[PDB]
Amino acid sequence: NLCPFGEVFNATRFASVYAWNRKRISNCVADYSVLYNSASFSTFKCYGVSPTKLNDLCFTNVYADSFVIRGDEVRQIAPGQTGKIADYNYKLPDDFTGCVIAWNSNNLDSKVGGNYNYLYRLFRKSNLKPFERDISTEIYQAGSTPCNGVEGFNCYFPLQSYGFQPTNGVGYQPYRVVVLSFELLHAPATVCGPGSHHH
């Protein structure tokens, strides 16, 4: 059947970047043309693969990580960047083979008065490793004295909210992101393009 990309991209609600949602896609025919021929995507950078010849290849699995960030942070969803997001929220590996897709979601994720559901991680004791995700709400210690309840001398809650208002600057508007990673193990290839040897 047709791979359920509709359910990932046109998804009614999206996840906070700190708790980025992954969907494994398997056992279907992936019509990648439907994506790159929707010319509504503001970012569509692919690394290590052809633009259209993905439509001919087969893969053991396709993983779709998805989340929401602000526009000027999109540049961090790429190999070997630093910044709040790539360091503390969603790190891509250096040898990344796959595609990063982003589009402006101001008319869906901003609301008059402000949307404070979409969060991100502000403080972490160290950097995330590639494809790692952290959703702990452990009280961050920046000061010297231990915290055990809520807050004290430099005892910040680690998560912060984006404030998404429809009248924010373009750079401060919400963008929805989908990262396709391709997996070709020595096992049956279940995700195939229509122009393959298999059909």
């Epitope: 949602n21 992954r22 969907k23 590639p130 494809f131 790692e132």
Partner: antibody, heavy 128, light 108 residues
């Protein structure tokens, strides 16, 4: 008490085949990646296979690729290793082990950290 | 991909002992350390480079930087004499890799 118990080892002839079991108890088995790791006599630990909390994804070491099959029955709290075409260099103690990370169930995401629970092992001698 | 350890390391009781583990871009993956006494199963003593599991003595610490992970036992004791293995799970292909092990001997 968290507990892994291996069983089904023994003496077996090369080229034949054998099915090992690992019985889990005292934790929500269905929510953890599981490992098979072996140790030949006087050698080090050799990774054999690994399986996702739900059995969706399976990875094998090259030495056993195509010959072994890892599987799990989540309803019965059990991990299985089907060993086929046994060679002599397969003689070893076989441990099952649990990864310390658990999936909540909601979005096909899993990161493997250390293997914090180990069984006591089951011994497989493959001789003619 | 291979993780390569010192074959043996001896140490007097009370001294600090260090076991190294080298691999290609090992800093970019998490390292685990397991202890195995004779005729016993392995036990996890370090995970996530430096974290120590519940119930593991505090004298066990761990680091990982560059291409080298290091298990450190300060105040080494008789009951620490064992084989120690490092391990890395590649973020890619979900492949597991052990080290050759290290026979830590405490001269008691």
């Amino acid at each position: 008490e968290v507990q892994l118990v291996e069983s089904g080892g023994g003496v077996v002839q090369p080229g034949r085949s054998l099915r090992l079991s690992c019985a889990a108890s005292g934790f929500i088995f269905s929510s953890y990646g599981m490992y098979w790791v072996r140790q030949a006599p006087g050698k080090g630990l050799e990774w054999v296979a690994v399986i996702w909390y739900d059995g969706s994804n399976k990875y094998y070491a090259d030495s056993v690729k195509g010959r072994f099959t890892i599987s799990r029955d989540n309803s019965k709290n059990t991990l299985y290793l089907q060993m086929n075409s046994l060679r002599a260099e397969d003689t070893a103690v076989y441990y099952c082990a649990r990864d310390l990370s658990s999936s909540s169930g909601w979005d096909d995401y899993y990161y493997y950290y250390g293997m914090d629970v180990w069984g006591q092992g089951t011994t497989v001698t493959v001789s003619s | 991909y291979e993780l390569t350890q010192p074959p043996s390391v001896s140490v007097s009781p009370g001294q600090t002992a260090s076991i190294t583990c080298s691999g290609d871009k090992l800093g970019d993956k998490y390292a685990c350390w397991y202890q195995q006494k004779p005729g016993q199963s392995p036990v996890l003593v370090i995970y996530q480079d430096s974290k120590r599991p519940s119930g593991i003595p505090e004298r066990f610490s761990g680091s990982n930087s560059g291409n080298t992970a290091t298990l450190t036992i300060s105040g080494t004791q008789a009951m620490d004499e064992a084989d120690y293995y490092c391990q890395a799970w590649d973020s890619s292909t979900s492949y597991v890799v052990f080290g050759g092990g290290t026979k830590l001997t405490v001269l008691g």
